[PDB]
Ligand binder design. Structure first.
Ligand SMILES: CCC1=C(C)/C(=C/C2=NC(=C\c3[nH]c(/C=C4\NC(=O)[C@H](C)[C@H]4CC)c(C)c3CCC(=O)O)/C(CCC(=O)O)=C2C)NC1=O
Ligand SMILES: CCC1=C(C)/C(=C/C2=NC(=C\c3[nH]c(/C=C4\NC(=O)[C@H](C)[C@H]4CC)c(C)c3CCC(=O)O)/C(CCC(=O)O)=C2C)NC1=O
Ligand SMILES: CCC1=C(C)/C(=C/C2=NC(=C\c3[nH]c(/C=C4\NC(=O)[C@H](C)[C@H]4CC)c(C)c3CCC(=O)O)/C(CCC(=O)O)=C2C)NC1=O
Ligand SMILES: CCC1=C(C)/C(=C/C2=NC(=C\c3[nH]c(/C=C4\NC(=O)[C@H](C)[C@H]4CC)c(C)c3CCC(=O)O)/C(CCC(=O)O)=C2C)NC1=O
Ligand SMILES: CCC1=C(C)/C(=C/C2=NC(=C\c3[nH]c(/C=C4\NC(=O)[C@H](C)[C@H]4CC)c(C)c3CCC(=O)O)/C(CCC(=O)O)=C2C)NC1=O
Ligand SMILES: CCC1=C(C)/C(=C/C2=NC(=C\c3[nH]c(/C=C4\NC(=O)[C@H](C)[C@H]4CC)c(C)c3CCC(=O)O)/C(CCC(=O)O)=C2C)NC1=O
Ligand SMILES: CCC1=C(C)/C(=C/C2=NC(=C\c3[nH]c(/C=C4\NC(=O)[C@H](C)[C@H]4CC)c(C)c3CCC(=O)O)/C(CCC(=O)O)=C2C)NC1=O
Ligand SMILES: CCC1=C(C)/C(=C/C2=NC(=C\c3[nH]c(/C=C4\NC(=O)[C@H](C)[C@H]4CC)c(C)c3CCC(=O)O)/C(CCC(=O)O)=C2C)NC1=O
Lengths: 161, 98, 253, 47, 160, 161, 161, 160, 161, 161, 161
């Protein structure tokens, strides 16, 4: 994984360069938003279970997928999918704190579509549940942190589609 | 240089995962949470994920209580974990011996 | 796939293994040295039975046209029929063995063997069923007491969302209240000095409510009331009185 | 690992192709596919 | 299934089924007929069982249907009765299988996680299952009721 | 793995249905043949070594594959192949007791052709040894149990070819 | 394809060298045996059908593979296998004339084992038929040309095994 | 990076970042501005730092540039100054990252093996780094020089 | 692994043959060169570090791959590549002593191209470093042992390309 | 392709057997149902377009896959998928007439999953469209012919999953 | 192939959206640089032969790959490689005009590494020749157009490595 600072340092180091004015620009940009990022991460850690509960209730709780024949019918499957949503929320929070989606590429999206296709998990319903989670999360953390979190939520949805 | 050339050079590597890894182990005089989070780290290594989505709850309880009390080492807990009914159901029944 | 189609399954042939002492009866001299006898009537010598006799056309002309007299579908099988073709000897190809026939096994519609049967089945599974139920409630009592004793309330547990669900369970079932965080992430506390300080009073010292609202929670020795809990005297401590410093107070430790 | 440490991922160097086989094992998610990564090592001339 | 479990437990040890396991399979296939009869009786009396269990639950736990309770309202009460019907069906499956593998693989593994994520008190589900157990055992003979409650008790133990 | 009972229950459960008359038909069919199945499994457990010995003697014992250059020339290879035949017999017995070949798919046939191809094991000779084992096994257990066992023997041979 | 002359010229050209004494040694060696090679090729072209007929008669004509169930039972399969043997003889003659088995690698052995394995053709019987053809061919062409032809026959058998 | 290291150390334990780790990330992002200022000052005075460090090294270790020494000749001296510039750049990276991860992952892991394979005395490189440390700390304030030498000291310790 | 003696014995044993005149020819050939092989192996063990140092100095020491951006820029990568070159030299020495490159196939080349491709290691530069090492090694051990060692060096380079 | 008659004749011919009583049993079974098969095939040929239209309308006509971003959004993709459904219906009719699914293996299922995976076609939606087509087809042809057709519909769905 | 305009329109159309402010931002960005792109494309079309000649002269003209044994020794190979370089330059110009490297993926990079590996063409030397061509091209077209062209040159080199 590499955060914004690591990415800037890598871009400068891969050219044998010292950190010039543009690197300082990006570094100041990250340092100004770090405190908002910490606030949002704390608030999201506070209310993870309620966020997942509300997203599931608004997205797929009463649809036909929770009915016999659906992919998430039995109790095993319901528990597995809520665990998946918890994974997505936690990794989106990591990406928001780091300011860089490389952790999502390395730890989440690598081989996820193939696993879901082998298992038979519907991708569209998953993307819609992540979109509903984006709504609740932006709601709870306010506009700026919600846009920051929605960046990585949309990153996960694009990597999954 | 540009984004395509830089991204190629930044990725050349074994992986940063090799540096970015932490080991668990029992040091002297751990409390009971410290024992619990070590047991939960074992469950993620031997079973590849948290157990609560593929067990009832009463399957490795006596193994957890035994390790939290300091009665068995880490190696005994891992050995007992690997020969539980949970490990048999997940990584033996659905696959060939190879 | 077509008509002439090769299958390993249907290949009875020594072509994949080179056993060059095996071919098909060819010469008249082959009957004395290599080949034994045809195993069926398709493999028989042309126009002869499997045993070597001339094949006769198997059916006659029915005398005695009559439904009550005369041979019919109700007529019993004469025992000398199986004797004629030699099917009564154990070294014959058509020797029937009824010990492993499906007809020899017991009928299941028969109520009698069924009730004889179920008792024998319960007799085996009783012990293992009882053992598994005992194990389940053992696990439940163990988790109730480690819930009451502080396990699962360290903040490393309260950070994960499954830990939060377990805390809400412990609260909802009235087993114990776990002090978590406020909505903005700060630790809850009743006295603002240190974090996670919880209330007390009037139910931390009540018994028989260790696993309240949990259905038939067998914790401890539930089959009796407990001892009266009285020891209101001080025993002098010999060599074990905690020696503190004089003219001062142990600050902290 | 001794008797105190939990096992971990362990990026290997000199078992002769242990590196890429270990990478494929750990980089795949649980139940990703039906493949067997190491059905055997391809036969060498000899015994 | 008893046959399946015997086969796996013999498979791990790399041996054929010993004569004890074959004896037990034999005893099971011999009792299969009364197993099907008991499953019949429990199966086709499902409406009364669910209804009377729901009553005993709501009288024993008025909070779940009180104003705001988890099963508060027409729809939530219908959903709770739906859950009780689910578990009765699983009990019939387990009765015909001769072992709690069907009940445990469907409806018991991860049940605490699901009901915690839904906000439902698991003790209420245990109470409902106990009430259904009494109602269902009332309609059976002595030995039949003993063998049938054998599975309700396991479902209750797993649902603590 | 799923036996006949598990398969019927799954077919009924995947539709939200109660076990109707056709499920009862299949269940009675399995319950009637269970005792014959137990008898056959006991008899096969009794004589596994002799069955394998006789099948090997009639199929590939004196062919050229056991001579120098053949796949099972050295003692290591001979022992390995007789162990393989023991595997096949034991799993066919499991499948016959269960009345369902899913255990063969999950524990035997999954990736077997690829392993044999990487090792260089001749597939035709293996299928012929399994066919010879089918003869001896049906011989020893009688006609009905022999047809039952031959079902799963042919299943293994088809999955291997 | 490359013959002996092409191989020598390539070995010399891949080093920027002129043809030195060792190249002259090999070239003289080929030029001395060329006339014997032409004689053998003519004689083999004369008697190809009889060679194949006699090899088939001595190797697999009365075995069980020509019987129902064998791989070469029906008339289609018999004709296909005699065509295969004709291929092997013609390409061995090409290799003997060229003094180099590279044509066998490029035009015969490339993907032959895989085709035979997919079709189910027994490899051992094929190798034995080629060995029987080697006998008849050496017989007909005499000792020296028979050793020359047997070189490429054994090359085909080794590439097939 | 401090954020990265906190995230991995929290990831191994399968927990979110505790309030201590978040506190420390907050303090880091708040000090990022003076971190960038210090990196500025060290970055754009690189020529004098490398030159004056090379002098102090060559006066303290005349053998390396003596006839035959590893850095003997124009080209070898230029290469040694190149190495000193490499390490100054890495120190600036570490200053902006807030931790020696950039310095240690680039230029410290396996440095003894490399310099032994090249025939270079590692103690000479340590001397050059110490001389550059004095020269660079001469241009900073008290607290800034203290915080900047914090990384030169780590680089020296790793290069023993 | 199999050396020259093991290979001859295997070729004789895979046909049920006793060791005839050609096997004696090959065995004498190996026994005559064994002492030269031991001398070369000793000399190479004596000067491994200097051989690797000189090959690296002549092949890739001052190129752009050692500068920022190049593979082996950092100290980790430099140490890793010199360790790789040590591996290649040691295994080439093993192969020269054994007179058979099967150890290179089993312990070195198996899955090496795939590892290098996943890591991003340039194959051409590696082959050129091995070629430079071949020069120094032949230089140090003299003409005959240098040709022997260069056989296995070229074997590694061909297996890597 | 082989129908029921071809399969029986092949099973008898692969053993050198004449058609005995069991072959006569199977042949009579096919001959009794042939007329019902012809009736069903005629009725299905009559109403292919309406069957496909109704299946598409009930299965995926108003879902999100037909909206922008969905697999069959543009007109090219819509036409391609309705052509695919026509293929499935026609080949299921062929299989029902033949009484043997080998034509489905040879002409439909061979390499279909791989093509769909390379194109990105969702497999679950395809299986659901085939299931909806099974409903309409059984509806139109009545119970017995509907079970016959559903056999091959489920065969296609199992080969696709 | 899709250019910048096609990509923006596709991103908007795959969501059922009208072109909003961000699409206008990207479209204006492309429209502002289009004239510089046309100038650069004209200048590159003017001097393609001289660019290739100078890149070959600075990269691999006097190295050992042009000598006997090297890839491109003979006149056939020299002509083939200069034709390859012409391909790379022309397709990089197409990509620069389009503002999108999808044409490089569809028409150049698809199966190129596999072709070069089957032929034995050294990949490192090819990447270095493309890098030398990038120098000359940026030189001839000036800084901004040179960065634009170098984007697609590096894209080709990354797709080839
Ligand atoms: C086969 C095993 C199995 C079970 C058991 C199962 C349960 C299950 N119970 C649910 C809801 C529910 N279940 C209840 C149940 C109760 N409320 C109470 O107070 C009582 C304690 C309890 C009834 C005894 C309620 C109220 C809901 C709706 C919750 C909501 O929507 O807010 C839901 C979400 C909606 C739905 O029914 O599809 C599932 C999936 N799924 C399964 O596959
Ligand atoms: C860290 C990144 C990461 C993810 C996300 C991950 C997912 C993952 N999800 C799984 C299953 C699953 N995932 C789901 C999820 C869903 N069902 C639905 O209908 C919804 C659309 C969706 C939830 C939103 C279900 C139901 C299963 C169980 C499949 C089964 O039991 O057959 C499994 C199989 C393991 C097991 O449960 O035994 C893995 C490995 N693994 C990872 O390493
Ligand atoms: C016994 C046979 C065998 C070999 C050869 C082998 C190689 C091997 N080389 C590796 C890395 C490496 N190999 C190199 C090598 C080179 N860089 C260059 O520029 C040069 C062209 C080349 C040296 C000549 C480098 C730089 C790495 C480190 C990659 C990284 O850190 O990302 C790794 C990753 C393991 C690690 O270092 O953590 C393995 C497993 N393994 C084996 O089992
Ligand atoms: C199912 C289609 C089919 C056919 C027809 C078939 C024929 C066939 N005929 C054969 C031989 C033979 N066939 C004959 C037949 C004849 N001699 C005469 O003069 C007559 C004109 C003719 C009898 C009418 C003879 C003499 C041989 C033996 C030839 C020999 O071994 O030299 C052989 C070699 C030995 C064997 O029988 O296995 C085959 C394979 N195989 C097939 O799969
Ligand atoms: C130029 C090099 C070359 C060869 C050799 C070659 C062989 C080749 N042999 C084939 C079939 C065949 N080959 C055989 C051969 C044999 N059966 C036996 O029992 C014997 C051991 C063996 C003859 C010695 C048979 C029977 C078939 C037919 C398979 C079938 O119809 O299923 C086929 C399938 C094509 C067809 O007939 O439709 C090919 C392509 N192709 C080539 O390009
Ligand atoms: C970013 C981390 C990093 C470092 C540090 C690094 C060092 C490095 N130092 C080198 C050489 C060298 N380095 C020195 C250095 C010295 N001589 C002395 O006496 C002094 C003790 C010392 C200067 C302080 C010399 C003389 C050479 C050339 C050695 C030779 O070519 O013989 C070389 C080979 C040629 C080149 O510079 O490309 C490398 C790769 N590479 C890296 O990636
Ligand atoms: C972007 C290019 C594009 C087009 C054009 C498109 C058309 C399209 N038109 C549809 C339906 C339809 N379209 C019409 C249209 C008409 N009825 C009339 O009488 C008029 C002549 C006409 C209106 C001008 C009707 C009535 C339906 C519903 C048909 C039905 O459900 O029976 C449907 C099926 C349901 C749906 O809308 O998802 C599609 C996919 N899809 C595309 O991707
Ligand atoms: C085996 C077939 C073959 C040929 C012929 C060949 C030719 C060839 N000629 C070259 C150069 C050259 N060739 C010449 C030749 C000439 N100048 C004149 O005025 C005369 C007309 C002519 C001499 C008769 C010159 C001057 C160069 C150097 C051009 C330069 O570097 O600018 C080069 C580039 C450098 C090098 O020699 O490696 C090659 C590859 N390569 C081959 O593989």
């Amino acid at each position: 994984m590499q955060d914004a600072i690591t990415s800037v340092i890598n871009a400068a180091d891969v050219q044998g360069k010292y950190l010039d004015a543009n690197s300082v620009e990006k570094l100041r940009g990250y340092f100004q938003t770090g405190e908002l990022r910490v606030r949002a991460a704390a608030t999201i850690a506070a209310n993870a279970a309620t966020i997942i509960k509300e997203a599931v209730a608004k997205s797929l709780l009463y649809s036909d997928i929770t009915r016999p024949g659906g992919n998430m019918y039995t109790t095993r499957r319901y528990a597995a999918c809520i665990r998946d949503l918890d994974y997505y929320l936690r990794y989106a929070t990591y990406g928001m704190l780091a300011g860089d989606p490389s952790i999502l590429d390395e730890r989440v999206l690598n081989g996820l579509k193939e696993t879901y296709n082998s298992l038979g998990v519907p991708i569209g319903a998953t993307i819609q549940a992540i979109q509903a989670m984006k709504e609740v999360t932006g709601s709870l953390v306010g506009s700026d942190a919600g846009k920051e979190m929605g960046l990585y939520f949309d990153y996960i949805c694009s990597g999954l589609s | 240089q540009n984004l395509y050339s830089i991204k190629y050079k930044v990725k050349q590597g074994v992986s940063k995962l090799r540096d970015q890894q932490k080991i668990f182990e029992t040091k002297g005089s751990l409390s009971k949470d410290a024992y619990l989070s070590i047991f939960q780290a074992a469950c993620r290594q031997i079973f590849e994920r948290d157990i609560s989505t593929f067990v009832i709850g009463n399957e490795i309880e006596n193994i957890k209580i035994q390790f939290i009390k300091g009665q068995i080492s880490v190696k005994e807990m891992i050995n007992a974990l690997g020969k539980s009914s949970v490990y048999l159901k997940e990584f033996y029944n659905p696959y060939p011996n190879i | 796939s077509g008509y002439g189609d090769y299958s390993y399954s249907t290949d009875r042939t020594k072509g994949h293994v080179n056993q060059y002492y095996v071919d098909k009866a060819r010469s008249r001299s082959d009957w004395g040295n290599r080949n034994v006898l045809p195993a069926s009537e398709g493999d028989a010598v042309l126009g002869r039975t499997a045993k070597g006799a001339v094949a006769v056309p198997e059916f006659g002309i029915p005398q005695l046209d009559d439904p009550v007299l005369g041979f019919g579908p109700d007529s019993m099988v004469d025992p000398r029929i199986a004797e004629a073709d030699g099917a009564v000897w154990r070294w014959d190809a058509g020797f029937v063995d009824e010990s492993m026939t499906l007809a020899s096994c017991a009928d299941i519609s028969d109520e009698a063997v069924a009730d004889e049967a179920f008792a024998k089945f319960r007799g085996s599974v009783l012990a293992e069923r009882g053992a598994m139920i005992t194990k389940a409630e053992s696990a439940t009592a163990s988790v109730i007491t480690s819930l009451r004793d502080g396990l699962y309330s360290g903040e490393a547990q309260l950070l994960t969302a499954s830990g939060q669900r377990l805390a809400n369970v412990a609260g909802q079932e009235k087993i114990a209240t776990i002090s978590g965080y406020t909505w903005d992430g700060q630790p809850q506390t009743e006295i603002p000095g240190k974090p996670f300080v919880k209330s007390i009073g009037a139910m931390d010292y009540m018994d028989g409510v260790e696993g309240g609202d949990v259905v038939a929670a067998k914790v401890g020795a539930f089959w009796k009331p407990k001892a009266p809990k009285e020891v209101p005297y001080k025993r002098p401590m010999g060599a074990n009185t905690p020696e503190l410093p004089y003219n001062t107070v142990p600050r902290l430790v | 690992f001794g008797e105190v440490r939990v096992p971990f991922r362990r990026f290997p160097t000199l078992p002769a192709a242990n590196f890429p086989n270990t990478n494929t094992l750990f980089d795949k998610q649980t139940k990703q596919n039906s493949v067997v990564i190491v059905p055997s090592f391809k036969a060498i001339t000899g015994n | 299934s008893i046959v399946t479990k015997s086969i796996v437990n013999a498979d791990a040890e790399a041996r054929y089924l010993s004569p004890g396991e074959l004896d037990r399979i034999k005893s099971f296939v011999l009792s299969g007929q009364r197993r099907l009869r008991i499953a019949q009786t429990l199966t086709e009396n499902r409406e009364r069982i669910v209804k009377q269990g729901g009553q005993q639950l709501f009288q024993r736990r008025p909070d779940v249907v009180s104003p705001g309770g988890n099963a508060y309202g027409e729809e939530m009460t219908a959903t709770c009765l739906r859950d009780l019907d689910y578990y009765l069906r699983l009990v019939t499956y387990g009765i015909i299988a001769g072992d709690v593998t069907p009940i445990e693989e469907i409806g018991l593994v991860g049940v605490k996680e699901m009901y915690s994520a839904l906000g439902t008190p698991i003790s209420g589900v245990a109470e409902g299952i106990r009430c259904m157990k009494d109602v269902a055992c009332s309609l059976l003979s002595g030995e039949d009721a003993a063998e049938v409650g054998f599975y309700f008790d396991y479902t209750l133990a797993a649902m603590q």
